[PDB]
Scaffold this active site. Structure first.
Site, PDB file in Angstrom:
ATOM      1  N   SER A  31       1.757  -5.323   8.609  1.00  0.00           N
ATOM      2  CA  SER A  31       1.701  -6.343   7.592  1.00  0.00           C
ATOM      3  C   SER A  31       0.944  -5.403   6.305  1.00  0.00           C
ATOM      4  CB  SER A  31       0.669  -7.323   7.820  1.00  0.00           C
ATOM      5  OG  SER A  31      -0.761  -6.715   7.777  1.00  0.00           O
ATOM      6  N   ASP A  32       1.210  -5.949   4.992  1.00  0.00           N
ATOM      7  CA  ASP A  32       0.678  -5.595   4.026  1.00  0.00           C
ATOM      8  C   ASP A  32      -0.632  -5.985   4.056  1.00  0.00           C
ATOM      9  OD1 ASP A  32       0.218  -4.444   1.292  1.00  0.00           O
ATOM     10  OD2 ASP A  32       2.402  -5.307   0.793  1.00  0.00           O
ATOM     11  N   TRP A  33      -1.650  -5.452   3.183  1.00  0.00           N
ATOM     12  CA  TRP A  33      -2.898  -5.499   3.466  1.00  0.00           C
ATOM     13  C   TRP A  33      -3.274  -7.077   3.009  1.00  0.00           C
ATOM     14  CZ3 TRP A  33      -1.062  -1.259   4.976  1.00  0.00           C
ATOM     15  CH2 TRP A  33      -1.870  -0.389   5.395  1.00  0.00           C
ATOM     16  N   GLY A  34      -3.653  -7.959   3.827  1.00  0.00           N
ATOM     17  CA  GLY A  34      -4.006  -9.242   3.935  1.00  0.00           C
ATOM     18  C   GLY A  34      -2.800 -10.222   4.169  1.00  0.00           C
ATOM     19  N   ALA A  35      -1.580  -9.580   4.584  1.00  0.00           N
ATOM     20  CA  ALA A  35      -0.346 -10.661   4.768  1.00  0.00           C
ATOM     21  C   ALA A  35      -0.357 -11.135   6.149  1.00  0.00           C
ATOM     22  CB  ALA A  35       0.903  -9.475   4.302  1.00  0.00           C
TER      23      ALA A  35
END
Length: 674
Positions: free
Chosen positions: A215-219
């Site tokens: 994931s992207d950071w926080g996705a």
């Protein structure tokens, strides 16, 4: 083979599905699974501010049309990772530049899917050829910064299959990125981190992706839902692996699914293990800086060159104007501390080139300084040629924001107008992460060099091009329009109330402009050079039921050694679906000395002639004539030739609701016609 998921307990399996911290994989060191470091770098290692080579951002490097050179940049990036114990470098980003106002355009490659895929693959193949992983970034349809954490990109299947997927698809099938990063946004109501169709049905079951998805950071919003969708790795860790353990025990996660997801994380460590076991490796700083030097040279596009004002005679009286020449803008925090950086001014100074410098303007939003403006006018008034450096300051491309205008700062335009009143021999060099408008002020410049962002070696590269040590060879990877309101996406940009509807469909960029006969400032694939070239001997031959082959000769007809990028477009006839007038389906860059010629060939597979059919739920080559165009630009075609294809023979269940034309085009119904 040890280690595998068979050697792990449930708690150890679940821990692998999220990093150890915000920059490391989960380390199970007790069982031989190290938590290697993961860090950014689509155009160079960005550890942590550790000195590394800052290569030109993709918005510049995409001007090269040179996969071999891009492959070479990747090898250098991996070697720096090997020194710094970095197993995966988080790039490259291949999102389509749907609208040039997109805040991340500087980090992406093109508005065209074929160009982006066949360029950025050099990063994946290059880095991983040294044993270091990459991360094909933001899968998929992450084309704006505005409300990126929540917005739903509502996209038709055709537009997904033909525009926003092919670059991802080509790199996955041609290379095989050890890691993929999903995007923050939703696609038709589903966040990418949670989209099983995206991460499993398409990416793995159809395309054969063998790697990991992070994931992207926080996705990652739902640990269980993301894992079931095919997301191997949550980054950064929210310290919620207990949710994977609980769900694996009460039947919300099948044991096979957790084993598949966690084993992939073991395979990633094993794929990167050798490179991370190399002790005391130091990369050649000067050698990597030279790769950046060559990469910077090929990141410039020559837009205009009246009276051949470029190249400059090197012995001429030069007036350098513009703060960009002393304080360069060369990248997009994404900051890379360069190993070495020399501005354009220090480059001319170190080369004995004596110039007169005037800042002219400041790189801030402050109003125009009449004092600096007057000094710049007194300079260049006493000069053979004035090299004026204009473009966007960093605050005009603030991180996390989309632009609201294409224009360069107005006080920079005012200075150009004032300088032009006293000296017409002006060369404007542009610094910008994404498309800026040119036509409103181009009348005050005889030469316009679009240098985008060049990286740490922009200084020397600019001197070599401007003073004729090398000829510029860049072609636009982005359309320069007359006005942002000509873009067919501007009506649906940036969206509202949590959604943005891609109402333009497959007609993105030049696909729209070339189909509806719209003027642009500079077309996709355009670029001037110090040399002249001629194309002849063009021959297109059919090689199968639905394949063709292109043969052409390109010749340097000048006295200057320079490179030319031949481009092949496919112009299909009237089809059952709406299609752009032509689409890029091949290219080749050739370096030719004065008088030399070269024979180049292009293979056009079935996908060069196929659109996505939502009726077939598959690619479809329709029977009929297809025009193959050969040229040096999307609006500079040298020769054309018509090929007639058979069609792929795909048939449809026919019923009463169909039309006679649907039977006439069906192989089973074609016999019913007569």
């Amino acid at each position: 083979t040890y280690p595998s998921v068979n050697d792990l307990t449930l708690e150890e399996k679940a821990s692998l599905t999220s990093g150890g911290d915000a920059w490391h994989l989960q380390g199970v060191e007790a069982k031989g699974i190290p938590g290697y470091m993961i860090t950014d770098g689509p155009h160079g290692l960005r550890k942590s501010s550790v000195p590394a080579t800052c290569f030109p951002p993709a918005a510049g490097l995409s001007s090269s049309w040179n996969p071999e050179l891009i492959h070479q940049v990747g090898e250098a990036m991996a070697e720096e990772c090997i020194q710094e114990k970095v197993a995966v470098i988080l790039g490259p980003g291949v999102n389509i530049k749907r609208n040039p106002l997109g805040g991340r355009c500087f980090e992406y490659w093109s508005e065209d899917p074929y160009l982006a895929g066949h360029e950025a693959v050099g990063i994946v193949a290059g880095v991983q050829s040294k044993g270091v992983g990459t991360s094909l970034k933001h899968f998929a349809a992450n084309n704006q910064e505005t409300d990126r954490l929540r917005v739903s990109a509502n996209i038709s299947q055709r537009a997904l299959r033909e525009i926003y997927f092919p670059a991802f698809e080509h790199i996955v099938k041609t290379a095989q990125p050890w890691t993929i990063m999903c995007s923050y946004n939703r696609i038709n109501g589903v966040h990418s981190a949670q989209n099983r169709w995206l991460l499993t049905d398409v990416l793995r079951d159809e395309w054969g992706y063998e790697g990991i998805v992070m994931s992207d950071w926080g996705a990652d919003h739902d640990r269980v839902a993301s894992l079931n969708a095919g997301l191997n790795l949550e980054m950064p860790p929210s310290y919620t692996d207990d949710q994977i353990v609980y769900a694996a025990r009460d039947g919300r996660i099948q044991p096979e699914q957790l084993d598949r997801m966690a084993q992939g994380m073991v395979d990633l460590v094993n794929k990167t293990r050798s490179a991370m076991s190399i002790d005391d490796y130091h990369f050649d700083v000067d050698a990597h800086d030279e790769v950046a030097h060559q990469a910077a040279i090929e990141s410039m596009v020559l837009l205009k060159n009246d009276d051949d004002i470029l190249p400059v005679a090197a012995n001429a009286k030069i007036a350098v104007i513009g703060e960009f020449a002393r304080t360069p803008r060369y990248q997009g925090s994404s900051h890379i501390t360069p190993t070495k950086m020399t501005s354009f001014l220090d480059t001319l100074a170190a080369r004995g080139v004596d110039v007169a410098f005037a800042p002219g303007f400041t790189l801030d939003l402050e109003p125009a300084d009449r004092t600096l403006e007057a000094e710049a006018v007194e300079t260049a008034k006493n000069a053979d040629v004035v090299l004026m450096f204009l473009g966007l300051p960093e605050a005009a491309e603030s991180e996390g924001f989309d632009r609201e205008t294409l224009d360069i700062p107005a006080k920079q335009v005012e200075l150009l107008k004032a300088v032009a009143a006293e000296n017409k021999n002006i060369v404007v060099v542009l610094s910008n992460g994404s498309v800026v408008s040119v036509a409103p002020w181009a009348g005050n410049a005889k030469g316009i060099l679009e240098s985008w962002l060049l990286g740490q070696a922009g200084g020397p590269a600019l001197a070599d091009v401007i003073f004729g040590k090398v000829s510029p060879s860049g072609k636009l990877a982005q359309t320069i329009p007359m006005n942002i309101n000509d873009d067919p996406s501007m009506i649906n940009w940036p969206g509202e109330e949590g959604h943005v509807d891609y109402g333009e469909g497959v007609f993105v960029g030049y696909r729209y402009y070339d189909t509806y006969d719209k003027a642009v400032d500079y077309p996709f694939g355009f670029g001037l050079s110090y040399a002249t070239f001629a194309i002849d001997g063009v021959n297109v031959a059919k090689t199968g039921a639905n394949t063709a082959h292109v043969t052409a000769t390109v010749t340097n007809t000048s006295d200057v050694d320079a490179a030319e990028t031949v481009q092949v477009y496919v112009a299909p006839g009237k089809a059952a679906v709406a299609r752009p007038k032509h689409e890029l389906k091949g290219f080749r860059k050739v370096f030719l000395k004065a008088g030399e010629s070269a024979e180049i060939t292009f293979d056009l597979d079935e996908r060069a002639f196929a659109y996505w059919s939502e009726k077939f739920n598959d690619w479809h080559v329709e029977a009929g004539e297809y025009t193959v165009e050969v040229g040096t630009s999307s609006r500079d075609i040298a020769a054309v030739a018509v090929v007639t294809l058979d069609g792929d023979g795909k048939a449809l269940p026919l019923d009463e609701w169909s039309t006679f034309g649907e039977w006439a085009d069906d192989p089973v119904g074609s016999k019913i016609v007569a």
